[PDB]
């Protein structure tokens, strides 16, 4: 069935490449390739707030 | 005890200075006096008691929220069970702690005045009619130089 | 205090009407009387205390059970840990709450009779020998018209 008028689908995936490690992409087709990625250091651990209160 | 709202019926509005003390009718000042020790030891004890109900709860950083997909309903419910569990415990333990320690606080004032009343009756002995209201008719209506010394609890014969 | 089972030793079986009162031997009725205020204020307070240990626990709808497959043993154990945790908390807090507030209830009766006894001794003064048993030998053995007025605490000289 169509969703946003699309019968096709794109499945999205992710991983946290550790410092020093290498990630390798190999494709014969159908790859939605990465273009920009994120360099981050995780904090102690928090959560999401859902609100309309102004910052 | 039965001191507060028992045989000392109601209370006095005229003590801007403290919580406990005396009212003397003799030949001079008709005012009220504070017992800066009977009182400054109670405030030293009550503020100590509030500050420990407040500050004995150390709590770590915690993000309570958890998000689960439509095939994780069991986790969602396990998580909700944990949140309901704490809510039920803290709600019940707090409501009762407030309820019980409030009575423990009102008794504290009974035991204090009853000891202040017994701090002068167990000192003046048979030199006054011990009226049940919480008051003593003086045989030699002390002036302001003597009455201010019964506050320290100091007499002669 | 030391009123109950201290200097008033045992208790009376003859009071079908209340929890506290008097026993008078004078020249007429050898019966017992209830103090409808010393008593109806205690029941107003105790039923208030039970009803708040009962009803201060609001609890939501909860299905405690959780089912896990053979590759979910960790969840199973996490869940069991949560159930054991609450059990341990409510079992310990309940057992002790019952234990402590029972003593707080038995003292309540000490403080009540001791104040009722002190409601007449601090009123009759030296018009009776103050026997240590909790009883007073009357100098003018009051008839039933007077004794029923000491209940209200009303005398003359």
Cβ atoms of B132 and C122 closer than 8 Å: yes
Q: Which domains does chain C have, with CATH numbers?
A: 1-157 (3.90.20.10)
Query: Rounded distance, CA B40 to CA B50, Å?
Result: 16
Resolution (A): 2.9
Which residue in C52, C67, C82 is closest to B82 by CB distance? C82
Cβ atoms of B21 and B35 closer than 8 Å: yes
* Cβ contacts of B64 on chain A, cutoff 8 Å: 47
**Residue C116 CB neighbours (<10 A):** 20
Cβ atoms of C60 and B92 closer than 8 Å: no
Among C56, C89, C96, pick the best mutation site for testing chain B contact (most B Cβ within 10 A): C56
Query: Rounded distance, CA C143 to CA B85, Å?
Result: 63
Tell me the residue ranges of DSSP E strands in chain B.
21-23, 32-34, 128-131, 135-138
Cβ atoms of C125 and C9 closer than 8 Å: no
Q: What technique determined this structure?
A: X-ray
Q: Residue with structure tokens 């208790």?
A: C11
Contact B91 C123 (CB under 8 A): no
Query: Rounded distance, CA C56 to CA C50, Å?
Result: 10
Contact C122 B100 (CB under 8 A): no
């Amino acid at each position: 069935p169509k969703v946003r008028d699309q019968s096709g689908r794109m499945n999205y995936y992710w991983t946290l490449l550790e410092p020093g490690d290498t990630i390798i992409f190999e494709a014969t087709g159908n790859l939605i390739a990465p273009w920009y990625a994120f360099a981050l250091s995780r904090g102690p651990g928090s959560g999401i707030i859902t609100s309309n209160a102004p910052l | 005890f039965g001191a507060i709202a028992g045989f000392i019926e109601g209370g006095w509005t005229g003590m801007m200075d403290g919580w406990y003390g005396y009212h003397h009718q003799n030949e001079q000042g008709s005012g009220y006096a504070a017992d800066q020790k009977s009182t400054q030891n109670a405030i030293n004890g009550i503020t100590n008691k509030v500050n420990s109900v407040i500050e004995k709860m150390n709590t770590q950083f915690t993000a309570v929220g958890k998000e689960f997909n439509k095939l994780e309903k069991r986790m969602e419910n396990l998580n909700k069970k944990v949140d309901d569990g704490f809510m039920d415990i803290w709600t019940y333990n707090a409501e009762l702690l407030v309820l019980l320690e409030n009575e423990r606080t009102l008794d504290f004032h009974d035991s204090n005045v009853k000891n202040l009343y017994e701090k002068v009756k167990n000192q003046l002995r048979n030199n006054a009619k011990e009226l049940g209201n919480g008051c003593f008719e003086f045989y030699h209506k002390c002036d302001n130089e003597c009455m201010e010394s019964v506050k320290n609890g100091t007499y002669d014969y």
